[PDB]
Each structure stands twice: as C-alpha cells, then as structure tokens.
Amino acid sequence: MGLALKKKSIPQPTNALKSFNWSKLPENKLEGTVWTEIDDTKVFKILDLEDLERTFSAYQRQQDFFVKELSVIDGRRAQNCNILLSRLKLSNDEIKRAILTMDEQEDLPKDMLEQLLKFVPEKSDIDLLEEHKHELDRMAKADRFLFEMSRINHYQQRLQSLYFKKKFAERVAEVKPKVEAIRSGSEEVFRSGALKQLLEVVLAFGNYMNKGQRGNAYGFKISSLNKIADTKSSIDKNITLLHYLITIVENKYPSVLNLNEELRDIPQAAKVNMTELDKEISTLRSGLKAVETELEYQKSQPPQPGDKFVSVVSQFITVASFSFSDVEDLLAEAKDLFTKAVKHFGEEAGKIQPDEFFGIFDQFLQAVSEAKQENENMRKKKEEEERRARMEAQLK
Amino acid sequence: KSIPQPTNALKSFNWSKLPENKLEGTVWTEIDDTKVFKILDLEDLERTFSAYQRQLKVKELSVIDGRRAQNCNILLSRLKLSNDEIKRAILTMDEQEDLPKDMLEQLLKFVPEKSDIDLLEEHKHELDRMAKADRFLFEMSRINHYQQRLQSLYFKKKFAERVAEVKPKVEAIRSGSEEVFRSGALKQLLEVVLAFGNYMNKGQRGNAYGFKISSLNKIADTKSSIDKNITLLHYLITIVENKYPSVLNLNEELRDIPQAAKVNMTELDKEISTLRSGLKAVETELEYQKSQPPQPGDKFVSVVSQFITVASFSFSDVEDLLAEAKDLFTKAVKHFGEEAGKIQPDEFFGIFDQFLQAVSEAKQENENMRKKKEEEERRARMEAQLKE
Numbered sequence A: 001m002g003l004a005l006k007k008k009s010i011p012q013p014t015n016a017l018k019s020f021n022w023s024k025l026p027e028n029k030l031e032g033t034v035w036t037e038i039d040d041t042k043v044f045k046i047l048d049l050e051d052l053e054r055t056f057s058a059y060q061r062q063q064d065f066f067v068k069e070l071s072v073i074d075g076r077r078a079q080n081c082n083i084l085l086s087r088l089k090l091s092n093d094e095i096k097r098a099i100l101t102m103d104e105q106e107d108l109p110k111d112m113l114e115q116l117l118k119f120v121p122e123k124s125d126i127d128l129l130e131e132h133k134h135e136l137d138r139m140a141k142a143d144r145f146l147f148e149m150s151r152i153n154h155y156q157q158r159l160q161s162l163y164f165k166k167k168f169a170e171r172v173a174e175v176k177p178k179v180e181a182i183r184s185g186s187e188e189v190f191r192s193g194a195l196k197q198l199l200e201v202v203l204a205f206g207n208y209m210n211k212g213q214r215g216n217a218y219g220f221k222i223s224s225l226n227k228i229a230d231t232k233s234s235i236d237k238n239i240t241l242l243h244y245l246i247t248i249v250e251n252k253y254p255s256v257l258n259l260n261e262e263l264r265d266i267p268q269a270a271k272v273n274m275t276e277l278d279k280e281i282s283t284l285r286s287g288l289k290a291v292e293t294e295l296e297y298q299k300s301q302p303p304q305p306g307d308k309f310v311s312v313v314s315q316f317i318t319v320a321s322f323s324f325s326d327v328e329d330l331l332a333e334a335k336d337l338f339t340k341a342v343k344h345f346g347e348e349a350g351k352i353q354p355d356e357f358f359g360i361f362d363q364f365l366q367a368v369s370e371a372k373q374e375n376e377n378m379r380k381k382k383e384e385e386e387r388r389a390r391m392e393a394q395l396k
Numbered sequence B: 001k002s003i004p005q006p007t008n009a010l011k012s013f014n015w016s017k018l019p020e021n022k023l024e025g026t027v028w029t030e031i032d033d034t035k036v037f038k039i040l041d042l043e044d045l046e047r048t049f050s051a052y053q054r055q056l057k058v059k060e061l062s063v064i065d066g067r068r069a070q071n072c073n074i075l076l077s078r079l080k081l082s083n084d085e086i087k088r089a090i091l092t093m094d095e096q097e098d099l100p101k102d103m104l105e106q107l108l109k110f111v112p113e114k115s116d117i118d119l120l121e122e123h124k125h126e127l128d129r130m131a132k133a134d135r136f137l138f139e140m141s142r143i144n145h146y147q148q149r150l151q152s153l154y155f156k157k158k159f160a161e162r163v164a165e166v167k168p169k170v171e172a173i174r175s176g177s178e179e180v181f182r183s184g185a186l187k188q189l190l191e192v193v194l195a196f197g198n199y200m201n202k203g204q205r206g207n208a209y210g211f212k213i214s215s216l217n218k219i220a221d222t223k224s225s226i227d228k229n230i231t232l233l234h235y236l237i238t239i240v241e242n243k244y245p246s247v248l249n250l251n252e253e254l255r256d257i258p259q260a261a262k263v264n265m266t267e268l269d270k271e272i273s274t275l276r277s278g279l280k281a282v283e284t285e286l287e288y289q290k291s292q293p294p295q296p297g298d299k300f301v302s303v304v305s306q307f308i309t310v311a312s313f314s315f316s317d318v319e320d321l322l323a324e325a326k327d328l329f330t331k332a333v334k335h336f337g338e339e340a341g342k343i344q345p346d347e348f349f350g351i352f353d354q355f356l357q358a359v360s361e362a363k364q365e366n367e368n369m370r371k372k373k374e375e376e377e378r379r380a381r382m383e384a385q386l387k388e
Helices: A049-055 A075-088 A092-100 A110-116 A123-130 A141-150 A155-166 A169-191 A193-208 A222-227 A241-250 A254-258 A274-299 A309-344 A354-395 B042-048 B066-079 B083-091 B101-107 B114-121 B132-141 B146-157 B160-164 B167-182 B184-199 B213-221 B232-241 B245-253 B265-290 B300-335 B345-376
Strands: A059-061 A068-070
Touching (some): A075 A141, A092 A155, A169 A309, A193 A222, A193 A254, A193 B042, A241 A254, A309 A354, B066 B101, B083 B132, B101 B146, B146 B265, B160 B167, B167 B300, B213 B345, B265 B300, B300 B345
C-alpha cells in the first residue's frame, strides 16, 4: 500500500522456473535503506529473459535418486529432504496417516520426528507449490513431500505436539531427580550435626591459630573448608591441618564420624546446574502450553476420519498437565529450600548455584575422605615401625 | 569472648572471615568455639603447628599457608631478583627493565593482603631467617601502595600493545561500514539479484522491493535445470559481467570486509574498558602519590605524570575513533535492513565475506568449464574426423 511502492511493469515467465529462496524485506522496513535506490525494473530492460527461462526450468530430466520432472524447491533444502526421506522409509500417505493418528502404529521414532520438524513446508513453499496441484504427478520427491504435508491441517503443530508427547516421560524423568537432589541436598546440609560440630572445632582452630587481628572470628565462608589442608604441620610437611582436625575430631567428637551419611545426597546435587535445569523446565512448560493451545484449536474443528488428535491429545494433556503441575510444585519447594540453606551458611542471596554451593562441600567431603585414609596409612606405618623398635631393642 | 591465645607463634590457617553483621540467622548463631577450647589439648596443637620449623641448626619462621608459600617460591624462582632488587624496580617503575611483563602479571597475583601484613608484623624483629615466601610478602608489604605501584607498572608496560591491537579493529569497522555503504558494485549486484528473484519464484513469493542481505548466501542453492553444477550464482556472475562490468570492481570496493568480519564488537568493548578503567586507576594512584612527601628512588610521580599525559592522549584518540566507527556501523546496518542493534560486525560483515568467497570460487569454477567447453568445441574435431 502507498504511492511510494508504485512498482509496475512485471514481466513474468511464460513457463515455470526454479525458485530462488530469499527472505523478502517488508515494504515498511524498506525506508531509508539501499532498496530506496534500487529498481529491478532497470534490469529487465537488459536481461535476456528467454535465456534465463531455459537455463532454470522448473521441469528437468529425471534427477536420479540420492519424461520430465518438476522441481521448484532449491537444491539445498531439496537434498536434505531426500536424505531425510531415505532414512525415514515411509510413503507420504503413511506419514500423513501417522501424524493424523499421533502415530498409533509407532512408525515415527523420536529421532525422525525431530528431523521432520526441521523440514516443514513454510508459507513460501505452499504458495510456490500451489501453481502445480494439477501435476503433483511426477513432481520431484522432495517437492511432492512438502506439498503433501502442507495439505495437512496445522501440520506444524500436529508434529510438534506428537514429538513433545513422545518426549515427555524422559524429560520429566530427567528433571525430578535433579530437583530432588537439590531438595535433599539443601536439607541435609541444613541439619547435619556432624557438619555443624565440624565447623565449631575448625573455628576454634582458626581462632587459636592465626591470632592477632586475624582471629576473633564468629564464622567463615564455607569455602574456607577447602583451605584447611593448605596449612601444613611443622613436624611433618605431609600431615596437613585437615589430617589433624580429623584425628582430634574423631577422638573428642565421635558423632562427626556420621558426616558422609548425613550428607549422602551432596555428591548427586553438586552436579545439578540450576540454569540448565530451569531450561528443561521451560521447555516442558512452554511445550505444554503449545499442546493445549493446539488441542483447543483442534477441538473447534469438525471431526474427520483418521484425525485422532483431540482424542489422543486430550488424554495426554490430562495425564501430562497433572504430572507437570507436580514437577513445578517440587521445583519451587527445592529452590525455596536452597536459598534457605544458602543464607544458612553465609553465602550471598542469589549469587551461588547448587553445583558450586554443594560443590564446596562435595570437594571437602573428598578432601576429608582421602586424608582420613592417609591417616590410617600413617597409623599403620607407625605401628609396624614400633613393633620393630620393641623387638629390635628386645633382641639386642 | 574468652580468648585463650597461644604462648608461641603458630602456622596461620587462611580462612575467609565472615563479618559479624552478615552472621545473623546462620549456623554460626548456634556455634560457639568456646565449647571447644574446654577440651582442646592446646599444648599439643602448638607443638604440631609451630611458626618455627626446621628446613642440627636454627629453625625457620613460616606463617603463610603451604599453598600460597609454594606458589610464591615458584614465582620467585623464575623471577631471580633479591627482594631489594624488586623493591627498587617497582620504586623506579622498572628503570633497569628487570621486570618483564609476564612476571609483572604473576607478581600481581601474589600481593601481600592485609591479613598477611598483620600476621607477619608480629615478627618484624626476626625477618632474619624467616622463610623465603614469608620474607617476600613482608618485604613488599613495607612498600607504600605496592599493589597500585605494581598495577600501574603493568598497565604502563602493557599500553602500546593494547592500544595497538585495538585501533585496527575499530578502523576495520570504520572502513568496513563505509565500504559497504558506498559500493556501487554491491548496489548494482543487489539490483540484478532482485530482478532474478522477481522473475524466478513468481506468484505471491515475488513483487519484492528488497531482501535480507543473508539471501546472498542462498543464491547458489538454486540449481540449474541444464546442469546441477551450474548454480544460480554462477549464472548471476556470468551475465552480470557482460551487462554490468562495473560490478567487476566488487572485491576492490569491499577490500576491508574480510578484515572486519573478524572483529567481535563484544570483546572489542572489553579491551576498550580495561584501557579506560586501568587508566582511571593509574591517574588515581598518581594523584595520591603526588600528595605524598618526595623520596630518594621513588620515581613514580615523575615517570607516571609523564606517562599519563602521553597515554591519556593516545587514548582520548581511541575513544573518538571508536565512537565514529560504532556510529557508521549502526548506519551501515540500517542501510541494509538489519534490525537496530541486533547484529554485530563479525556477523554483519560475515555475511558479505561469505558472499565474496562464494563469488570468487564460482567465478573460478566458471572459467574452468569456460575452458573445458572450449577444448571440446575444438577437440571433438581431432576425433570426429580422424574416424573417417
């Protein structure tokens, strides 16, 4: 609309040609751009149109597998589509039937649907392929497919829903343990006595130790935990403060022994990445909304033979919508308990994620584990060294 | 608050204390180290973690934690300078060029933090036989504004490099932006492409007045009918040359494009900031050091007053060219229909660079068949008659 775009002389091809496949610029977005100085009209007064037409005919010789043939779609898309079709091994008819039955015969695997979703007939294609409904007869395999599917109502959404349906158990399954691992982790850390008593003794150490103005501390960043081994003994450069804390704590604070047990879910919580997790959550949320929307639309259409969408989907959403309402419940719970634990140990508001937060304790729990072992080794090497001393003396 | 304090010095721990305020409603509310001291064999602990350590003969004094101490040893090993030498170097902004910029960078990672000075002061009497690492930190700590004097030195030694690898990137954008905007070879190439499309994919898929530049890299996707090897790009080239020769001058008027499709405006902006802030800090330390009584060997104000004038000049410039380059970019971006600030140079000019390739390699393939067909129009002769 508007006098500006007063284009005019459109010399168009007497016969069908192959298509270009550009991305047109809307009339509106055209102001103050190069296109204000470009007029394709000027070119036509010089172009050898007849040449062009025979050079890029829509009809061509039997472009053999991966007597004229009609091919409009560009070679790029055309090829990837044929590669897809070949792995798929289903006639257009079978495919159509499958997406209209939400694949009751289970002919469309998850990996394929994902692929199908990559080559859906866009607005442009339908328009370009319309001028040939009369001869879909011998119409390039690729070209034929895009049309056949484009003739299915809401094919895009029909697919996306079928894919989402197929990939819902998995997605929900892989999210529950993650959210639980944070729930469980947040709690354990919050109520472990072994951990609490551990910190108490460490604080004493640090206060008696680095005296001066470096002490008189009432608490320290949990990370400090992983710097305890940094302090080396003066008797033996291998006996680290952590080794010490461990030996004395075991002999004056036996309850601490149950540290790993009251922190059993720490490791499988140090791996959970809140960011990533939030994604998987949205994928499921938005995905659901899409399905519901498509279900509603579908419900407002007259029934049909073989179109078991509404049937199948209404059943899905029921089950799905419930199970997810659940995931989202536990999630908020878990996230709630996390920030609680976070603040509980001095860490700033929402500035640390579980993989790191729990990372901190997970690393310490290792450090502790291997030092506790290094400690036994020295306890044995010291005992054998003492049975020698005894007998070596006894003998002489 | 009952503070049982050690009779003798011990190794430090090196935790990260938590301020009293940020302690409410935390586990610390239920923890009292007092309860611990009532059962702790303090005598034992002291002996096990004495500041004085062997390493028969006098012992050594080491407070700094084993990890930090090692790191320092390592550094000092590669550095090979007496504490007196370094002291002197950073006091004279490295007059004798004894501090390479890669050491300066390492030195900056191990600067005496306050916790250290405080914990080391208790030993100023006996820095004599005081573990290497420990001696270093104390020694350096005794230099006024060490960390800043250091940081300034680094920044200074690393200013030409930085501004050097910055200027070209901005000019590459400045130039890139203008070249694209002015190329008549590009303007005319675009026009023809337009007509091709309008003629080609007819219907409602045409009557276009423009297209996304990116479309350029999709021309070759339209395959010929005669031969699946002759792509629409090849053809576009063939006929463009013989009806619009000015277009031959494309690579010529887009000379700066490949050397601009590389610039990442993001990263660029960081380099620019590290320069601005770092400069800010040197200026600040200057003013401070200027309000301090002079001293023999303290050539900071001297060396830096000089630097900043020179530097603040070389930069004020950078600042200006950048703004100019950013400006012309946004303009160029708008000129080709791209969305406001949703496209960066690496990608914007990427589009064109990709095109220029595809074009240069098609024009080539173009000549190959242009000769293989000439040979066959002459070589079907040496065989379509020698069979008579």
